[PDB]
Swiss-Prot record, chain A:
Changing R85A: Slightly affects methyltransferase activity of the enzyme alone, while it impairs methyltransferase activity in complex. The gene is KMT2A. Changing Q81L: Leads to stable interaction with ASH2L and RBBP5 in the absence of WDR5. Changing H6Y: Increased interaction with WDR5. This is MLL cleavage product C180. Changing Y72F: Slightly affects methyltransferase activity toward unmodified or monomethylated H3K4me. The chain holds residues 3764 to 3969 of 3969 of the full protein.
Curated annotation (Swiss-Prot), chain C:
Interacts with PAXBP1; the interaction is direct and links a WDR5-containing histone methyltransferase complex to PAX7 and PAX3. Interacts with HCFC1. Component of the ATAC complex, a complex with histone acetyltransferase activity on histones H3 and H4. Component of the SET1 complex, at least composed of the catalytic subunit (SETD1A or SETD1B), WDR5, WDR82, RBBP5, ASH2L/ASH2, CXXC1/CFP1, HCFC1 and DPY30. Core component of several methyltransferase-containing complexes including MLL1/MLL, MLL2/3 (also named ASCOM complex) and MLL4/WBP7. The gene is WDR5. It is found in: Nucleus. It comes from Homo sapiens. WD repeats lie at residues 11-50, 53-94, 96-136, 137-176, 180-221, 224-264, 267-300. This is WD repeat-containing protein 5. InterPro entries: G-protein_beta_WD-40_rep, WD40/YVTN_repeat-like_dom_sf, WD40_repeat_CS, WD40_repeat_dom_sf, WD40_rpt. The record marks D75, F101, F231, E290 as: Important for interaction with histone H3. Changing F231W: Strongly reduced affinity for histone H3. Changing E290A: Strongly reduced affinity for histone H3. No effect on interaction with KMT2A. Changing F101D: Strongly reduced affinity for histone H3.
Swiss-Prot record, chain D:
It comes from Homo sapiens. Keywords: Acetylation, Chromatin regulator, DNA-binding, Metal-binding, Methylation, Nucleus, Phosphoprotein, Transcription, Transcription regulation, Zinc, Zinc-finger. The chain holds residues 381 to 598 of 628 of the full protein. This is Set1/Ash2 histone methyltransferase complex subunit ASH2. Both monomethylated and dimethylated on arginine residues in the C-terminus. Methylation is not required for nuclear localization, nor for MLL complex integrity or maintenance of global histone H3K4me3 levels. Ubiquitously expressed. Predominantly expressed in adult heart and testis and fetal lung and liver, with barely detectable expression in adult lung, liver, kidney, prostate, and peripheral leukocytes. The keyword DNA-binding applies. Residues 1-161 form the B30.2/SPRY domain. It is found in: Nucleus. Interacts with HCFC1. Core component of several methyltransferase-containing complexes including MLL1/MLL, MLL2/3 (also named ASCOM complex) and MLL4/WBP7. GO terms for biological process: DNA damage response; hemopoiesis; positive regulation of cell population proliferation; response to estrogen; transcription initiation-coupled chromatin remodeling.
From Swiss-Prot, chain F:
The modification Phosphoserine is found at S349. Component of the SET1 complex, at least composed of the catalytic subunit (SETD1A or SETD1B), WDR5, WDR82, RBBP5, ASH2L/ASH2, CXXC1/CFP1, HCFC1 and DPY30. Core component of several methyltransferase-containing complexes including MLL1/MLL, MLL2/3 (also named ASCOM complex) and MLL4/WBP7. The modification Phosphothreonine is found at T251. The gene is RBBP5. The lineage of its organism: Eukaryota, Metazoa, Chordata, Craniata, Vertebrata. Ubiquitously expressed. Keywords: Chromatin regulator, Isopeptide bond, Nucleus, Phosphoprotein, Repeat, Transcription, Transcription regulation, Ubl conjugation, WD repeat. It comes from Homo sapiens (Human). This is Retinoblastoma-binding protein 5.
């Protein structure tokens, strides 16, 4: 089979995480819960092989509607370095993951981050976020919306103003766009 | 005539061992008292005190206060699992309870 | 640079898939895809017998330290035990779901590594015959896995530039050498000092990567390798010879200082895809792809 | 007449005197609304203490820049490096002239007689190199990308420490 | 009496002392000139231990001799 | 041999990590020189060898009918020596397993050992009589003379270098003998308790230096330095480097051995099956271990270059190493999994800055 000329080899970029067993099931004040978050966000969630698009963030512990899930943390950049880092990541053939906090700064997830990069998009979400104050340094905290069971790939809405790139996720009642 | 190495520092602890040995001779608990029991017991009492004061300090910072008032002690015991089982039938004064509302006493919305 | 052509070994109807020596340096099996392995010798092309009994086409045969255990990495998605002094298959190691491309043995005769195209590298017992562990390794079909000097490390390439180093006992990856450009790193192998790891890419650039720092600043160019998984080797009885195959009917051997063309040994009639160095002599096995079918041995 | 209220990086140590600032954790290019349009105007930048790994880019920038963006991006701003004298402007790397030291009396002069420019690095009133030429439309604000925690102090009054030799300007205490 | 104290590390050290000194004088001298902790000034007299609670003249060593110290932890 | 970039805060054993559920009825255990193999004796007189890197059972050799209760490896790792109630001076090969020596000599043996450099000199410790040193080819046997002859329980060994022969009776009197000429250069009675003497169970040594151990019977492990014995010489009176005991449970010990670097001491109970680990230098307990709570401990090993510990209880040989934690950046070193808001501004060469091999290394060396 080596004399065969199989050329599935290099049509995408360098990265992978696939072929994992992505089937687990078929189915207080603020800073104390922030401590709870930093404790239990490792054991709560998991990144595995999605059927939607590549990979996704699953869920294992049965979450009640309202608790914290994970903090979407990474490097910290300002508004200037966006186009420069985008040109570099496009030059190396790397997808660019960023998330704006507010009118001040943006948290990167490309070179340094956590296991929270890997949430796909839908238009019927079950997650959102707000702005808190852990001693001046504000943060990006994943709340919940409804009782999420085990095995579900997690989703949230991106609050996009409707303004190119098509809908390569496929939700149910989606507007066929991210914006 | 030698160095008065007290049995606290000779052991490497913080709780006194002389007071513990006095309160084991003078409690009528047995006739004769060994010389490993007050050391071992001072260590156990120290570790439990450290165990509760760690969580007390964490909650005291996390509600943005300097000192520790007993509401933090109530939260620090009753949030933990094993210390709540130890302090089973105990009421801390000025304690209060955990904030807990049942699942059916709050409304929900269906239409639109 | 005086390796002259001496012999011609043929007799296979499909392409001669691979030709790898025995680690003691006394045997050279002709695993061709036609369900025929003629047991050739190593000093003149000394035919002993033809061992068969397969199910589908043969892709690769591995060699163990006793030079007796052979395994069939046939296209039947399984691996069978083939001892030389048996004439009798013992076990069949089912458990893959796609075709098997490469397999090896440990330096101390009691491990089997495998490869499957569906991104799951399986680890296999020898005698009691069990799937030991499974590795969710790559993005690609498995190109090359390799034991180190004793059985503590496993290097692994991919088709998009993932030179990954794996642990034997704990069974997790250890180091991933990556380039920003992605030439498909077809073939990788260790060095006997445990400090260097070879690589073979589809861009006419052959590199011997350092182990720790992972670099090579004396790189080879000017050769012909852009479409296939051409095997490269190390001659052990001369000096710093770097043995490889060719696409224009040649046998590529170079020195470390050269980084040029010094010796292109003629004789074949197709793309030279499989070589091996006889570990005790100046003998280099050489067989090309389908339009040659004539294994040609070499001698100084 | 103090340091800027509007046109400052808000995280700076703009203390109660509003003349001396400690640099923040980025290219904190603080500007000032007391900047020139045309005429003859000069003040001093009485830099006092400059610790290592606290660079400073010197020039004159236009009001439509960003507070966090360093100096010398395009026609708005002209920058220059302390070490090795390597100006960077419009994405160009050119090792150009000699640098400066630590805590000198800086401050540049620009002149627009009523299209043509006087752009020279003035280090204590000394010719250090001509940076660029033929500036474009806009007001010109003093923009210095204060790199890290350094002690700089803007000078306002007529008691000039190192005034330029035989160069005429209206004093900067006559605008605010 | 200039004693020699060569340890097991090639660390020879000299003290010109009286024959009628105590152990505390030797402790003070070694702690002066090297800062060695005086809970390890054990010495050996034909195998047997030289105990650290007597005087030098209780053993009648030949004057200006050579002894050997042992690196010891006693009070940790 | 292994990975050099691995040391992300290496540890000292904590977990249970899984055992050998293959063949029970183990009786003793010992490693080779590097720490790559482990001979284990069966109950009927067999040998179990387990390889470590492959985690595979290496070789099973059936020696005799009597249970195998003493083992040792040669320096190259090719000659196993052993003795039992079979009374036989044995010698075995690792490629073949051959009966090279067979001399059924009485008073069955409790411990064997090679001289650590020459494998010609072997140790023999009888049931009653004084210990014997032998050769390989001929029957030149050297019984060491003992003034006591009343315990009929004498322990002796060779140290790390093979310089001398430390001997010990069951009255606690030590007679240091030179390894070839039997020079009685040093002697000391152990300063047991207030005055009253004790027995000596065993004596072992190190891998680096001359610190060693004394395993008495008054529940007190004592640590001496062999150069202090050399500095004393005859009529020595050594007082120990560090004393060891556990008076909470008053536990007499069964087996001791040192670390690979001579830094840590493990010792095992005879009652509770619970292992303890000590520091040599500062002198305190660092960690208690446990296991199956009601089994009887037999023999404890240690792995020299890597923190691995082998126990023996109910014929089961445990292996305890960290249950080590794996993470990211070995699959992709360009990405590192942080935890919180990490700032990236310390380098100054940003914002569009553009500025203005020859080592020949062998490939088949050692
Ligand atoms: N359903 C979908 N299919 C493809 N891309 C999607 C998508 N939903 C959102 N996106 C875009 O793609 C990114 C999703 S992150 C994709 C998950 C993970 N990185 C993986 O490789 O599997 C976001 O930047 C978003 O803008
Ligand atoms: Zn969509």
């Amino acid at each position: 089979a080596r004399a065969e000329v199989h050329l599935r080899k290099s049509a995408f970029d360098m990265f992978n995480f696939l072929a994992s067993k992505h089937r687990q099931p078929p189915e207080l004040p603020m800073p104390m819960r922030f401590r709870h978050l930093k404790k239990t966000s490792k054991e709560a969630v998991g990144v595995y092989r999605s059927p939607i698009h590549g990979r996704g963030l699953f869920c294992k512990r049965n979450i009640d509607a309202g608790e914290m899930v994970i903090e979407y943390a990474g490097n910290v950049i300002r508004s200037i370095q966006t186009d420069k880092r985008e040109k570099y990541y496009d030059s190396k053939g790397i997808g660019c993951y960023m998330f704006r906090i507010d009118d001040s700064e943006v948290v990167d997830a490309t070179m340094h981050g956590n296991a929270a990069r890997f949430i796909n998009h839908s238009c019927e979400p079950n997650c959102y976020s707000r702005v808190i104050n852990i001693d001046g340094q504000k943060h990006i905290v994943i709340f919940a919306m409804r009782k999420i069971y085990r095995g579900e790939e997690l989703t949230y809405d991106y609050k996009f103003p409707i303004e190119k790139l098509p809908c390569n996720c496929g939700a149910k009642k989606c507007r066929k766009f991210l914006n | 005539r030698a160095k008065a190495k007290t049995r606290s520092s000779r052991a490497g602890l913080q709780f006194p061992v002389g007071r513990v040995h006095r309160l084991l001779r003078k409690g009528n608990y047995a006739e004769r008292v060994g010389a490993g029991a007050p050391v071992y017991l001072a260590a156990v009492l120290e570790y439990l005190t450290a165990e509760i004061l760690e969580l007390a300090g964490n909650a005291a910072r996390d509600n943005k206060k300097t000192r520790i008032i007993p509401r933090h002690l109530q939260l620090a015991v009753r949030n933990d699992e094993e210390l709540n089982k130890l302090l089973g039938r105990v009421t801390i004064a000025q304690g209060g309870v955990l904030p807990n509302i049942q699942s059916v006493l709050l409304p929900k919305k269906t239409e639109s | 640079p005086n390796y002259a052509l001496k012999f011609t070994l043929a007799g296979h109807t499909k392409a001669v898939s691979s030709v790898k020596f025995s680690p003691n340096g006394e045997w050279l099996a002709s695993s061709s895809a036609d369900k025929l392995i003629k047991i050739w010798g190593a000093y003149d092309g000394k035919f002993e017998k033809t061992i068969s009994g397969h199910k589908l086409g043969i892709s690769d045969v591995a060699w163990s330290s006793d030079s007796n255990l052979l395994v069939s990495a046939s296209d039947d998605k399984t691996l069978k035990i083939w001892d030389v002094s048996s004439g009798k298959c013992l076990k069949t190691l089912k458990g893959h779901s796609n075709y098997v491309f490469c397999c090896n043995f440990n330096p101390q005769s009691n491990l089997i590594v495998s490869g499957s195209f569906d991104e799951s590298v399986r680890i296999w017992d020898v005698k009691t015959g069990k799937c030991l562990k499974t590795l969710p390794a790559h993005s690609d079909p498995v190109s090359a896995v390799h034991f180190n000097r004793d059985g503590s490390l496993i290097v692994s390439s991919s088709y998009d530039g993932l030179c990954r180093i794996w642990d034997t006992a704990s069974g997790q990856c250890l180091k991933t050498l990556i380039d920003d450009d992605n030439p498909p790193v077809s073939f990788v192998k260790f060095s006997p000092n445990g400090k260097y790891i070879l690589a073979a890419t589809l861009d006419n650039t052959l590199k011997l990567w350092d182990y720790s720092k992972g670099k090579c600043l004396k790189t080879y160019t000017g050769h012909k390798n852009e479409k296939y998984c051409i095997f490269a080797n190390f001659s052990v009885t001369g000096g710093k010879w770097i043995v490889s195959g060719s696409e224009d009917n040649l046998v590529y051997i170079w020195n470390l200082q050269t980084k040029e063309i010094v010796q292109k040994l003629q004789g074949h009639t197709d793309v030279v895809i499989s070589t091996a160095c006889h570990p005790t002599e100046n003998i280099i096995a050489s067989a090309a792809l389908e339009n040659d079918k004539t294994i040609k041995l070499w001698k100084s | 007449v103090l340091l800027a209220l509007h046109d400052r990086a808000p995280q700076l140590k703009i203390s109660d005197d509003r003349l001396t600032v400690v640099g923040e954790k980025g290219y904190s290019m603080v500007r000032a609304s007391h900047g020139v349009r045309k005429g003859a105007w000069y003040f001093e930048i009485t830099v006092d203490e400059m610790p290592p790994d606290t660079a400073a880019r010197l020039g004159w920038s236009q009001p439509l820049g960003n507070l966090q963006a360093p100096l010398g991006y395009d026609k708005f701003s002209y920058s220059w490096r302390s070490k090795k004298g390597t100006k960077f402007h419009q994405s160009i790397g050119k090792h150009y002239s000699s640098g400066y030291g630590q805590g000198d009396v800086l401050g540049f002069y620009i002149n627009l007689p009523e299209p043509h420019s006087e752009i020279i690095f003035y280090k204590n009133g000394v010719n250090q190199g001509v940076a660029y030429k033929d500036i474009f439309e806009g007001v010109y604000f003093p923009a210095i990308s204060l790199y890290k925690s350094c002690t700089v102090s803007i000078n306002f009054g007529p008691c000039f420490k190192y005034p330029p030799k035989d160069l005429t300007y209206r004093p900067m205490s006559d605008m605010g | 009496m200039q004693i020699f104290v060569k340890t097991l590390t090639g660390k020879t050290i000299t003290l010109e002392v009286e024959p009628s000194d105590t152990i505390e004088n030797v402790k003070a001298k070694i702690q002066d000139k090297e800062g060695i902790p005086p809970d390890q000034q054990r010495l050996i007299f034909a195998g047997k231990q030289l105990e650290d609670g007597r005087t030098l003249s209780d053993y009648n060593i030949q004057k200006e001799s050579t002894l050997h110290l042992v690196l010891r932890l006693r009070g940790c | 041999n292994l990975e050099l970039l691995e040391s992300f805060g290496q540890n000292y054993p904590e977990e249970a990590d899984g055992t050998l559920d293959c063949i029970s009825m183990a009786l003793t255990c010992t490693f080779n020189r590097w720490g790559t193999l482990l001979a284990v004796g069966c109950n009927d007189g067999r040998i179990v060898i387990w390889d470590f890197l492959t985690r595979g059972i290496a070789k099973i050799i059936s020696a005799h009918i009597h249970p195998v209760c003493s083992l040792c490896w040669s320096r190259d790792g090719h000659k196993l020596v052993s003795a039992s109630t079979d009374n036989i001076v044995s010698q075995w090969d690792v490629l073949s397993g051959d009966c090279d020596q067979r001399f059924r000599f009485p008073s069955p043996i409790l411990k064997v050992q090679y001289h650590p450099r020459d494998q010609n000199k072997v140790l023999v410790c009888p049931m009653k009589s004084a210990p014997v040193m032998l050769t390989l080819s001929d029957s030149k046997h050297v019984v060491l003379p003992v003034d006591d002859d009343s315990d009929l329980n004498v322990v002796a060994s060779f140290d790390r270098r093979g310089e001398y022969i430390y001997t010990g009776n069951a009255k606690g009197k030590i007679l240091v003998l030179k390894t070839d000429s039997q020079d009685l250069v040093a002697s000391f009675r152990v300063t047991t308790g207030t005055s009253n003497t004790t027995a000596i169970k065993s004596i072992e040594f190190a891998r680096k230096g001359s610190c060693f151990l004394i395993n008495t019977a008054d529940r007190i492990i004592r640590v001496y330095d062999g150069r202090e014995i050399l500095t004393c010489g005859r009529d020595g009176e050594p007082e120990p480097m560090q004393k060891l005991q556990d008076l909470v449970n008053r536990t007499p010990w069964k087996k001791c051995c040192f670390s690979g670097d001579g830094e840590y001491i493990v010792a095992g109970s005879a009652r509770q099956h619970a292992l303890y680990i000590w520091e040599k230098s500062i002198g305190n307990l660092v960690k208690i271990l446990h296991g199956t709570r009601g089994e009887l401990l037999l023999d404890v090993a240690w792995h020299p270059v890597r923190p691995i510990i082998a126990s023996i209880s109910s014929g089961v040989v445990s292996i305890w190493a960290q249950n080590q934690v794996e993470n990211w950046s070995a699959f992709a070193p360009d990405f590192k999994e942080l935890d919180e808001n990490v700032e990236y501004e310390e380098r100054e060469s940003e914002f569009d800055i553009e500025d203005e091999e020859d080592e020949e290394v062998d490939v088949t060396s050692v």
